[PDB]
Amino acid sequence: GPLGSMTQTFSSKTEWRVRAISAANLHLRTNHIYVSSDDIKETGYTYILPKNVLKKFICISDLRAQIAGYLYGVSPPDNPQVKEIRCIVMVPQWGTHQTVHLPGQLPQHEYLKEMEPLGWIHTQPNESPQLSPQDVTTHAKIMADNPSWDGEKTIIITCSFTPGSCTLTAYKLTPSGYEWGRQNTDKGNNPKGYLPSHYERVQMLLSDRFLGFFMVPAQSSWNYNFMGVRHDPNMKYELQLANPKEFYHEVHRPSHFLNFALL
């Protein structure tokens, strides 16, 4: 062994570069979107998700850090059992591979006043045969702070990155689920009291028949995964009618640009 005869010099290879290159190719998956229909029968309403905003949601996402959008919609005049998702709202947020961090404050905009809240959609690195206990906790605590979320009406759509594609599956909480989730302070993967009888799958269908839209923050962007210190559960935000920027867009990571010029 050599102390100086074979000296070599470490060279940094930062983590986000690889994930940025990976996020650039996400558009390839928007043409292989599969909805899990595994539930033999349906419990709840039937939720219809327009492809256009689903594709944008996938495209603005990251393969590891979860992102989330709030779902707003209405029932078609015909039958109240169908819930058409009309809008996805992106709010200031950060996340890990397991969970998302959203502000306490729900979306508030006049443009949304004639629609009802339907829950939320979020990405996941891997398919799971079960709804996450983090997700149950998150949905339950939102319901506990916001009586406009009816447990028989608000859902969680998971968008999991299967290789080459995306798999969507939709859940709703059960009353036992809400009661456990709202008192759960264990953020791990196997918390005490977690039960598969805390959620149940709902029927979901992708559509091209109509188009949804996005709302985004009025002065910030939505992605705070690079500004984590600046994000706070109690932060307030307004909204505007515009489309969201992609995960690695320059306005989401300004320190990468200002720091490089300091070399």
Ligand X SMILES: NS(=O)(=O)c1cccc(O)c1
13 touching other proteins, by CB under 8 A: yes
Q: Which residue's CB comes closest to ligand X?
A: 52
Q: Answer for the pair 100, 62: CB distance below 8 angstroms, yes or no.
A: no
Q: Nearer Cβ to ligand X, position 36 or 52?
A: 52
35 phi and psi angles, rounded to 5 deg = -100, 125
Residue linked to tokens 């999991």:
160
- In the complex, the smallest distance separating the C-beta of residue 39 from other proteins, rounded to whole angstroms, is 29
- In the complex, the smallest distance separating the C-beta of residue 159 from ligand X, rounded to whole angstroms, is 18
**Pick from 5, 7, 8, 11: which binds other proteins (CB under 8 A)?**
11
**Pick from 47, 54, 56, 222: which binds other proteins (CB under 8 A)?**
56
Q: List Cα–Cα distances, 202 to 149, 155, 232, in angstroms.
A: 16, 8, 32
Q: Which residues, 6+ apart, have CB-to-CB distance to 116 below 8 Å?
A: 72, 73, 74, 148, 153
Q: Which of residues 181-200 bind other proteins (CB under 8 A)?
A: none
Q: List Cα–Cα distances, 89 to 68, 85, 107, 222, 258, in angstroms.
A: 9, 11, 7, 9, 29
Total number of residues that touch other proteins (CB under 8 A)? 39
Nearest to 212 by CA among 81, 74, 17: 74
Q: Nearer Cβ to ligand X, position 24 or 211?
A: 211
- In the complex, the smallest distance separating the C-beta of residue 21 from other proteins, rounded to whole angstroms, is 6
Residue ranges that bind ligand X, judged by CB under 6 A: 52, 211
- In the complex, the smallest distance separating the C-beta of residue 59 from ligand X, rounded to whole angstroms, is 12
User: Measured between alpha carbons, how far is 197 from 76 in angstroms, rounded to an integer?
Assistant: 30
Q: Nearer Cβ to ligand X, position 46 or 52?
A: 52
- In the complex, the smallest distance separating the C-beta of residue 187 from ligand X, rounded to whole angstroms, is 37
User: Measured between alpha carbons, how far is 29 from 166 in angstroms, rounded to an integer?
Assistant: 6
The contact set with other proteins (CB under 8 A) reads 11-14, 17-18, 20-21, 24, 27, 52, 55-56, 86, 111, 210-213, 219-220, 230, 240-243, 246, 248, 250-251, 253-254, 256-261, 263
